[PDB]
Amino acid sequence: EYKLVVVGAGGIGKSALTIQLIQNHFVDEYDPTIEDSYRKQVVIDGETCLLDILDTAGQEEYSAMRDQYMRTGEGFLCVFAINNTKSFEDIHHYREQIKRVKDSEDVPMVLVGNKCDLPSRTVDTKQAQDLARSYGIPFIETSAKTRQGVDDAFYTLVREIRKHKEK
């Protein structure tokens, strides 16, 4: 199973994106070794995927689990909101923490600019493309409200993980 982690500042749509992905892609699978014989699973681009959201503020200011999410995750959606400059400024620290915890210079990641439906844009596409280029990763704009780009962001992350697992 591919282990995907959605990371970013609070209030940017991480939960909204993940819920929309599950809604579109969950299936009920027959498994007679499980108690009730059926389990829900998310399948993305033919791969069974596990999904987790990493917040560090709010209730998660009190959590002991940040580094554990980073060690377990195999690929990361690094999310900001296009109407939240601070959330964009927060990206670098998240990426640096992931790289430090995983002790790897090759961590599958996709940069995601959410809320692209909103007219109040303070982070330009070019700013985000430049950041993604520096990191060597894809950038995609999404809206959980209108659904634009949501599947594409996760499908792209799955391909990034697949390439990493190949070699």
Ligand X SMILES: Nc1nc2c(ncn2[C@@H]2O[C@H](COP(=O)(O)OP(=O)(O)O)[C@@H](O)[C@H]2O)c(=O)[nH]1
H/E segment holding residue 26: strand 26-30
* Residue span 134-163 as binding mask against ligand X, x where in contact by CB under 6 A, dash where not: ---------xxx------------------
- Closest Cα partner for 70 from 3, 126, 10, 117? 3
Nearer Cβ to ligand X, position 116 or 137?
116
Q: Look up tokens 């430090």; give the residue.
A: 100
Nearer Cβ to ligand X, position 34 or 65?
65
Residue 87 within binding range of ligand X, rule CB under 6 A: no
Residue 122 within binding range of ligand X, rule CB under 6 A: no
HSE-CB at 154 with a 13 A cutoff on CA atoms is 31
Residue 129 within binding range of ligand X, rule CB under 6 A: no
Applying CB under 6 A, the site for ligand X has a residue count of 14
Q: List helix spans (H) across the chain.
A: 14-25, 66-72, 85-89, 91-102, 125-135, 150-166
Beta bridge partners of 5: 52, 76
- Report how many helices (DSSP H) and strands (DSSP E) the chain contains, helices first: 6, 7
In the complex, the smallest distance separating the C-beta of residue 111 from ligand X, rounded to whole angstroms, is: 15
State the residue number with the nearest CB to ligand X. 13
- CB burial of residue 100 (10 Å; 0-12, 13-18, 19+): exposed
In the complex, the smallest distance separating the C-beta of residue 12 from ligand X, rounded to whole angstroms, is: 4
In the complex, the smallest distance separating the C-beta of residue 31 from ligand X, rounded to whole angstroms, is: 30
Residue 101 within binding range of ligand X, rule CB under 6 A: no
Residue 121 within binding range of ligand X, rule CB under 6 A: no
Q: Which of residues 10-69 bind ligand X (CB under 6 A)?
A: 10-16
The site for ligand X (CB under 6 A) is made up of: 10-16, 114-115, 117-118, 143-145
